[PDB]
């Protein structure tokens, strides 16, 4: 459960991501494909190479969805209902992989926003990303 202080930390830090969010999304995907190469089997028809335009456009989709989930942090299961359908029913993405992408987002944000990424904000972002990963897996059959 997100605290009012978690909601404030998440809203303020993601506010600073701002117009750099598609860029942060694509760096998070690049980090995950490099460090955790088994994750690449969900994207068999993608050009997953440095500077790839297919990954730049997917990075932008992922970050828009998080901007939406920050805006609807009180009603995320509703706001993310169609993503939950796609990831659990059509793609059958194993839950371990959501932890891997969450780590890569936190690493990206830590590298880009060092003054915003305090221990309190780190703890709030970890909670938010785990709650998004919860909705996106909460379905399946």
């Amino acid at each position: 459960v997100l605290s009012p202080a978690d909601k404030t930390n998440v809203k303020a830090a993601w506010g600073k991501v701002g117009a750099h969010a598609g860029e942060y999304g694509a760096e998070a995907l690049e980090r995950m494909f490099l460090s955790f190469p088994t994750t690449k089997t969900y994207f068999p028809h993608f050009d997953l190479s440095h500077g790839s335009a297919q990954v730049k456009g997917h990075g932008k989709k992922v970050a828009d969805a998080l901007t939406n989930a920050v805006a609807h942090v009180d009603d995320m299961p509703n706001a993310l209902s169609a993503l939950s359908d796609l990831h659990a029913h059509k793609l059958r993405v194993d839950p371990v992989n959501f932890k891997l992408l969450s780590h890569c987002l936190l690493v990206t944000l830590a590298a880009h926003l060092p003054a915003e990424f305090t221990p309190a904000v780190h703890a709030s972002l970890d909670k938010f990303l785990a709650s998004v990963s919860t909705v996106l897996t909460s379905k399946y059959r």
């Binding site: 460090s35 590298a111 970890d126």
Partner: protein, 142 residues
């Protein structure tokens, strides 16, 4: 197994780590972000706020020891199981730390290095450090 290029990139970045600070930062972040870990450190005094945890003198001094062991691991990167043999017993026999917590601390360390090094912690350097931190965690599990 790590590539020569990975071993080199790992070593070049570690040379630039503050050995007095980075380990207490990493251990302080584990007690804030994953608070059940505080059950093992109840002799370190007050841990009841992020700021209490990050200013505890006992958390800073223990993070020095853990960063020292990670450093010993990087020097002996082809023989982690034998490097961490005594420490494996210490985290199992005396006080049982579930092996999933070792994985959480190594990911917290990767975040602390990213936070410190900025645009120098490039996606390839992170991939080499992830191999190292998985190495250490499997070596520490009993």
């Amino acid at each position: 197994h790590l590539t020569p290029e990975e071993k080199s990139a790992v070593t070049a970045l570690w040379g630039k780590v503050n050995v007095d600070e980075v380990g207490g930062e990493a251990l302080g972040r584990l007690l804030v972000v994953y608070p059940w870990t505080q059950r093992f450190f109840e002799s370190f005094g007050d841990l009841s706020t992020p700021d209490a945890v990050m200013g505890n003198p006992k958390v800073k001094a223990h993070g020095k020891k853990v960063l020292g062991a990670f450093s010993d691991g990087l020097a002996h990167l082809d023989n982690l199981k034998g490097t961490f043999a005594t420490l494996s017993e210490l985290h199992c026999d005396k006080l049982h730390v579930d092996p999933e917590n070792f994985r959480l601390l190594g990911n917290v360390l990767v975040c602390v290095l990213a936070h410190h090094f900025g645009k120098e912690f490039t996606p390839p350097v992170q991939a080499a450090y992830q191999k190292v931190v998985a190495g250490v965690a499997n070596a520490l599990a009993h």
